Amino acid sequence: LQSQFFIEHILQILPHRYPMLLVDRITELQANQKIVAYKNITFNEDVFNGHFPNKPIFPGVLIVEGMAQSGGFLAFTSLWGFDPEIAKTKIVYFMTIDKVKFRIPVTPGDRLEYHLEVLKHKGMIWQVGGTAQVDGKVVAEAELKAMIAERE
Amino acid sequence: SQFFIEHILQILPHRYPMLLVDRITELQANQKIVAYKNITFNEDVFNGHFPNKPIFPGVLIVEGMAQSGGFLAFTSLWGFDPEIAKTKIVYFMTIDKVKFRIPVTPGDRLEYHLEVLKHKGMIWQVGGTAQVDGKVVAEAELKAMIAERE
Amino acid sequence: QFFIEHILQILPHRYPMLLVDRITELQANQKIVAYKNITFNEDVFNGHFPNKPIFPGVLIVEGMAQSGGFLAFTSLWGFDPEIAKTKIVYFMTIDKVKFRIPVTPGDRLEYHLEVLKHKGMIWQVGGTAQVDGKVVAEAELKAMIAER
Amino acid sequence: QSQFFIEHILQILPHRYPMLLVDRITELQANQKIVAYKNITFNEDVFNGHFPNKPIFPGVLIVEGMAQSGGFLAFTSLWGFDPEIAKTKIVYFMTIDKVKFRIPVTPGDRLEYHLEVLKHKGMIWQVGGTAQVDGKVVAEAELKAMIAERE
Amino acid sequence: QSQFFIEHILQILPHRYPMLLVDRITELQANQKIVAYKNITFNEDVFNGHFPNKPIFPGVLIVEGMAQSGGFLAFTSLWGFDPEIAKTKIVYFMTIDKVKFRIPVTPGDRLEYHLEVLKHKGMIWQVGGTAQVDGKVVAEAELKAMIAER
Amino acid sequence: LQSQFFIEHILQILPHRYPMLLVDRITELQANQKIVAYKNITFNEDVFNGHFPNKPIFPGVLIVEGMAQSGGFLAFTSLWGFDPEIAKTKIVYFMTIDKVKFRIPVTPGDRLEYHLEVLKHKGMIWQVGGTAQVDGKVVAEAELKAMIAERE
Ligand SMILES: Cc1cc(O)c2c(c1)C(=O)c1cc(O)cc(O)c1C2=O
Ligand SMILES: Cc1cc(O)c2c(c1)C(=O)c1cc(O)cc(O)c1C2=O
Ligand SMILES: [Cl-]
Ligand SMILES: [Cl-]
Ligand SMILES: [Cl-]
Ligand SMILES: [Cl-]
Ligand SMILES: [Cl-]
Ligand SMILES: [Cl-]
């Protein structure tokens, strides 16, 4: 298992597609332990047409979504390594989300960095927690539990 | 007590494709709100969530509850006032106790049921559930703060 | 009932022109009752019209045509995703359509279509679109199913 | 007064993206007729779903384009070219009849609308005509629309 | 063939919405020149931001369209209308030169691309020409590309 | 006149809007001399749906467009400073483009940095040239001339 993955690799693992694939690159990854990835934030995103007119703010719920997708990548690869064929038959689902706190608004030009740690894992059930950071500062925190389920 | 999309557009700053509340059916000031958003396949999000399997994002369900809550907090204090609305902004500080029980898909009428757990000054804590045909599909608690637009 | 997943297996229409979310009633060579949810979160409303969201009358008719198409596909070959994937649908004629009430975000647009006549791939249906029990529009139409 | 471009169209019709289906007006006779057109390109969002690997301009949108052409005719015949008055107007479809599609419209076609006023009284205009591509009739249609103040 | 429609273009070029900027090919002389076009309509997403109340087809997209035309020419010159082989090739555009915009392009215009092979040495193709609206030259440019395995 | 401008400032000067506003932040600016700005590249951009399927590559022509907008921002603030009032009475027109080279493909996760200097300028006619960089490497080179004109 490598520690750096690019969008081409992410596309082979996550089922999310435009406009809900919110992870552009993975900078570090340790199986069963953690992942660090990020998503570039640019004004050229449809979401900003409505959030908000003349005041582009990246939706906090999307930051959370981005952290979850990062965790899902971590969970899957921790169990099957980089296996596109098996990834195509699995799907990660949100079970719970807790202790979410938004500290600083994310805006175009920002590099939204995800830092997720594995708090507990048993089979298909994974509990991760961490933060979203921009230039070293914590812009958000969250905890969530997800399940790796059958796509069919 | 009932507000249609045109009323909603005058209170909330959210616009396409992030305005996730279509109509308000019930509203008791300082108390509660019941509103909903129709889910249809003809929504852009379904192009990627997911291909060949349309499922309304759980985080967007939470977003819809937040918008309902902010509408509740705002109108409780100032009523239906478009003018004042433009001078205030309701952003969310925290979200907790979120649980997803059932997937939401095209054809569903996603109903938001939020109540005021507590409030002090401009800090408002709301909580409740998201329902589809009488069943709880999600639950969450959120804390918002009302401030002056920049 | 037939849900979006099933509708997708029969109708060739896709985003942003798939305007039927669920099929509630189906009677081969007789009639069909289906619907589409209308929400503000649809791109069409950016232009129809700004600050005044009104689902386009022509799209209501389109939705009725699609509902009629599903009835045609299934009356002809039953629920067969394999045959469906080779066909598409063409509008042939539209007539006697009248709009009575504007459809807007938050409405459940219900299609009610019955077959007036059919032969081969050519199907003629007519009926109404309803919101909460009221007729918001009436229309008759004829469409042709064909090989891609 | 007889030829208008997209700038002029945007100042009269209330429709906007992705529902403004008239690009240019080539000839206009007050209270009588109008000829306009819309270019059809693959680079339009409707083609993502109508259909996949077979782009066909929706018949219902051709009608919409004809109605919009009639709407422009109706408005200017009423108040002349007055953007300030047009700003707060809307256009509702009332009826559609005798429409027949003969030839599919595809990317690369110049969809030309030819509308003639069949009857009009106040805000209610009843127009009828055809949609053409390269001089051939691809569609026929009759429709009645009402111009209304945004209230 | 000499005339190709959108369904033919889709099988040769990898570009898809919103970056397929060639609607039809009207003329094609293997290794010599190509004449094709793209209709410009207000119903295109790019006009939402370029520019509000002043729809002007981006000059850079006119060049992109000219580049796509050159690519189709190069490819068809090498293998003809072969959808299967098309899936295994890519045309990287290396440079762009001598571009000049003389007249703005707007909704309602039929943007016609006129390109001819300037030089072909190995995997390198050099094309140049103009874009025209109703007989008038609206833009001109030179471009060089390299053919390679996808 | 300051040297750093964020998206809300760019919105008040450039007339470009979604999906054609392709500068996110200004990091350095010297009036009538040069400018350094950048646009974050993310998978969550509509353009990637067609360029290309299963292989996101930011269009070379859009990179040039981005450099042009940066130039236009420098040009305008050079003649009128940060003036939103006069900014809304103008648009920019591409006149020519020359010496364009595409050396490295740009992909999601990249921070596309624009480096432009003024080659010549008189009245509303500005001629700039420079590079587009990612992690300090030259991804593209270009020269272009633009004109600021009255919206009329
Ligand atoms: C520290 C912080 C966190 C946030 O999530 C927001 C803001 C600030 C914020 O100021 C803000 C303003 C606004 O107009 C809309 C928002 O969604 C917001 C915010 O969401
Ligand atoms: C037959 C064929 C195969 C290709 O891969 C391309 C093209 C044509 C092509 O025309 C083309 C044009 C272009 O501007 C960029 C491209 O990447 C391309 C292509 O990649
Ligand atoms: Cl937010
Ligand atoms: Cl979800
Ligand atoms: Cl209508
Ligand atoms: Cl059709
Ligand atoms: Cl330009
Ligand atoms: Cl490119």
Residue numbers in the entry:
A (entry chain A), F (entry chain D): 8 to 159
B (entry chain B): 10 to 159
C (entry chain F): 11 to 158
D (entry chain E): 9 to 159
E (entry chain C): 9 to 158
From the study:
Emodin was discovered as the inhibitor of HpFabZ by IC50 value of 9.7 ± 1.0 μM and further inhibition mode characterization suggested that it functioned as a competitive HpFabZ inhibitor with Ki value of 1.9 ± 0.3 μM. Emodin inhibited HpFabZ activity by either binding to Tyr100 or embedding into the middle of the tunnel C appropriately with favorable shape of complementary, thus preventing the substrate from accessing the active site. Different from the open and close conformations, the phenol ring of door residue Tyr100 flopped ~120° to a third conformation and paralleled the pyrrolidine ring of Pro112'. Ring A of Emodin was then stacked between the phenol ring and pyrrolidine ring forming a sandwich structure, while 3'-methyl of ring A also interacted with residues Arg110 and Ile111 via hydrophobic interactions. Apart from the interactions between ring A and residues near the tunnel entrance, ring C of Emodin also formed Vander Waals interactions with residues Phe59' and Ile98, and was stabilized in the right place by the hydrogen bond interaction between 6'-hydroxyl of ring C and water molecule 466 which formed H-bond to Oε2 of Glu159. In the other binding model (designated hereinafter as model B in Fig. 4C), Emodin entered into the middle of the tunnel C near the catalytic site, and located in the hydrophobic pocket consisting of residues Ile20, Leu21, Pro22, His23, Gly79, Phe83, Ile98, Val99 and Phe101. Ring A extended to the bottom of the tunnel and was stacked between residues Pro22 and Ile98, ring B interacted with residue Val99, while ring C bound to residues His23 and Phe101 through hydrophobic interactions. Additional hydrophobic interactions between 3'-methyl of ring A and residues Ile20 and Phe83, and hydrogen bond interactions between 6'-hydroxyl of ring C and water molecules of W12 and W402 which formed H-bonds to Oε1 and Oε2 of Glu72 respectively stabilized Emodin in the right place. The structural analysis indicated that the inhibitors specifically bound to tunnels B and C rather than the other four active tunnels of HpFabZ hexamer.
